[PDB]
Design a protein around this ligand. Structure first.
Ligand code: ADP
Ligand code: S3P
Length: 160
């Protein structure tokens, strides 16, 4: 049973998780990072060259794989990780709740361009709207990710 951060693009998982693992002396994993590196392509290049369904298969399979990990880990998650039925039972999951506009504001241009599902913003907005219920139903605890990192850190630690 790990500590799994979940949240739409730009909700600050990757760095939170890194802070969390330092404070708790646990190993940090990042699902995008793991797939990226096995396949030797960036997530964008994966979408572009191999198509989203394959990325989705990689994601879906890493879920199952990480369940066979022994040591509690901190695990940072890609936006879309909540679409997967099998996410249930991986770890106590912490949802980095923000609102579309705050979320978007803090991704510089280069940084948006790393995320294929931000190519069309109107579409990015409906995705947010749809994903909301999938975060909520996969969340052990909901965290107000609006303030700084510490403020999200504080809230997470409070839930042990
Ligand atoms: N408290 C915070 N709330 C939201 N975003 C933050 C916060 N603190 C830092 N960030 C920003 O989040 C940006 C992108 O999120 P990141 O850390 O990559 O996690 P994610 O995997 O959810 O995209 C970082 O480049 C950083 O500037
Ligand atoms: O929400 C999604 O479908 C995705 C979000 C991205 O993760 P980040 O939350 O690190 O930007 C990455 O997994 C990919 O572009 C798909």
């Amino acid at each position: 049973q790990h500590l799994v951060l979940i949240g739409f693009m730009g909700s600050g998982k990757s760095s939170l998780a890194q802070e969390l693992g330092l404070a708790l002396k646990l190993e940090v994993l990042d699902t995008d990072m793991i797939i990226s590196e096995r396949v030797g392509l960036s997530v964008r290049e994966i979408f572009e060259e191999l198509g989203e369904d394959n990325f989705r298969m990689f994601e879906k399979n890493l879920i199952d794989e990480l369940k066979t990990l022994k040591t509690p880990h901190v695990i940072s998650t890609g936006g879309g990780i909540v679409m997967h039925e099998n996410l249930k039972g991986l770890g106590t999951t912490f949802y980095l709740k923000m609102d579309f506009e705050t979320l978007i504001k803090r991704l510089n241009q280069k940084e948006r361009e790393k995320r294929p599902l931000l190519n069309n913003l109107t579409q990015a907005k409906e995705l947010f709207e749809k994903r909301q219920a999938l975060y909520e139903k996969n969340a052990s605890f909901i965290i107000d990710a609006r303030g700084g990192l510490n403020n999200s850190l504080k809230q997470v630690l409070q839930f042990i």
